[PDB]
């Protein structure tokens, strides 16, 4: 049982895939949890914007946040008879740090703007030069201007750039209230 000792929980995984992941994980030797219990070791996440993800990032940084592809790929490799690496593909299927983030900026000059786009791309997010209603985070130098006012109207998170640096350090999207502008 390669996943002996692993305890897997899901968040923002569709019911069909959740069933697939639970069964394959259990057949690989893992335990499966519907609720986020203390013994969970891996959180398979389809989104950052859920109570379970927020709980992991805030209170359980020991827990590994995984993409939905991890268990299907590991399972197939295992039943195909291939010799599993001792890491069990975990290092290849961490959820990208800024997965599903769509990051826009305002009131920050060059080259800082160019560097921010570079880090958003390297850490798995989408960079948005124009504010749209689907942006998830507006990094603002000041709480003023057109992008900022439409972010308020569109209910978009407005954060200071430390949100980006600390999320990158943590390998998880941190919550926005911790990075609200003064």
């Amino acid at each position: 049982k390669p996943l002996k000792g692993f305890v897997i929980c899901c968040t923002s995984i569709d019911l069909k895939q959740r069933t697939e992941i639970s069964t394959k994980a259990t057949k690989l030797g893992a335990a499966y949890r519907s609720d986020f219990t203390k013994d969970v070791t891996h959180l398979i996440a389809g989104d950052f914007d859920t109570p379970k993800y927020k709980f992991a990032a805030k209170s359980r940084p020991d827990i590994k946040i995984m993409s939905s592809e991890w268990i299907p790929v590991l399972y197939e490799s295992w039943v195909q008879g291939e010799d599993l690496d001792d890491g069990l593909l975990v290092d290849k299927h961490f959820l990208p740090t800024l997965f599903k983030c769509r990051v826009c900026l305002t009131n920050i000059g060059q080259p800082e703007r160019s560097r921010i786009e570079n880090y958003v791309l390297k850490h798995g997010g989408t960079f948005c030069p124009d504010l749209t209603r689907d942006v998830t985070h507006l990094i603002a130098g000041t709480s003023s201007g057109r992008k900022y006012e439409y972010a308020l109207k569109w209910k978009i998170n407005v954060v200071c750039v430390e949100w980006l640096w600390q999320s990158i350090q943590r390998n998880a999207v941190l919550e926005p209230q911790y990075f609200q502008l003064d």
Partner: peptide
């Protein structure tokens, strides 16, 4: 009343 707020020129 806009689709986007364009990147600051």
């Amino acid at each position: 009343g806009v689709m986007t707020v364009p990147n600051t020129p």
